[PDB]
Amino acid sequence: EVETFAFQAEIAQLMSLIINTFYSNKEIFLRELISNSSDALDKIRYESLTDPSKLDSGKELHINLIPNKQDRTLTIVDTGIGMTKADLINNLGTIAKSGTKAFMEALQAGADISMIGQFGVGFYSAYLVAEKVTVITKHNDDEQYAWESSAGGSFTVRTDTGEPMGRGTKVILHLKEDQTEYLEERRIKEIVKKHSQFIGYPITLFVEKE
Ligand SMILES: C#CCCCn1c(Sc2c(C)cc(C)cc2C)nc2c(N)ncnc21
Ligand SMILES: [Mg+2]
């Protein structure tokens, strides 16, 4: 059973701004998603210090970047804390309302889209390069979920019956037809080195079989 939800109006407005504004420096989406993975890895590491059983779902803390030219996807995988159903359906968008307002005010005042992570809403910069985003996620003591949106004001959430993850999050970017450069090894390597070089977890860039 797939449930469909409307974004809060302020979040729909942010997503439309990201999709519609002319802004050539699209590559900053990857730093934003890696930074989110790093924060989620920090969170499970910290919680594990007082409850070590939180790592029973996996001790390895790391990030994989996986391009797939057949599927036209770039996937950002982490073994961080993961997200609950309440996170996906209400709580993250609730928090994002204030950062959206501030971000949009700052843009009117002269800021640019690359500063989006200073407002806590960098995830939505995925829509600079993706026509659809699918988030697969598993938090301790909750089930595995798939969130999905092609923008347009709505998103879906379902329980995910696919390959079980131990714990963590996969952000699957279904790239726009004209954004396939972000599947190329040399392009991703360049962006990771430019914007993500001091992240405190291994980042493994997978390479394409074909
Ligand atoms: C880090 C951090 C905390 C914020 C939530 N979050 C995000 S960003 C996000 C937002 C703002 C809204 C929606 C509907 C979906 C997502 C993925 N990425 C991850 C991640 N890799 N692991 C755990 N939580 C994450
Ligand atoms: Mg929302």
- Please give the domain boundaries of the chain with CATH numbers for all domains: 1-210 (3.30.565.10)
Ligand 2 centroid from CA 61, angstroms: 29
| Whole-angstrom distance, CA of residue 117 vs CA of residue 208 | 29
E strands within 109-195?
130-138, 144-149, 154-159, 168-175
Q: Is 102 in the pocket of ligand 1 (CB under 6 A)?
A: no
Residue nearest to atom 18 of ligand 1 (CA): 36
32 close to 125: Cβ distance less than 8 angstroms: yes
Instruction: Assess whether the C-beta atom of 96 lies below 6 angstroms from ligand 1.
Output: yes
Q: What is the resolution of this structure in A?
A: 1.5
Q: Does ligand 1 come within 6 angstroms of the Cβ of 33?
A: no
Q: Distance (Å, rounded) from C-alpha 204 to C-alpha 86?
A: 30
Is the CB of 169 within 6 Å of ligand 1? Answer: yes
DSSP assignments along 73-85, one per residue: EEEEEE-S----H
- Which amino acid, residue 146? A
CA distance 199 to 192: 10
Rounded Cα distance between 17 and 15, Å, is 5
Rounded Cα gap, residues 147 and 155, in angstroms: 7
The helix (run of H) or strand (run of E) holding residue 141 is none
Residue 167 three-state SS: coil
Alpha helices, DSSP H only, in 21-117?
Answer: 28-50, 85-86, 92-108
In this structure, which residue's CA is closest to atom 1 in ligand 1? 36
Residues 6+ apart with CB under 8 A from 145: 83, 85, 88, 136, 137, 138, 157, 158, 159, 160
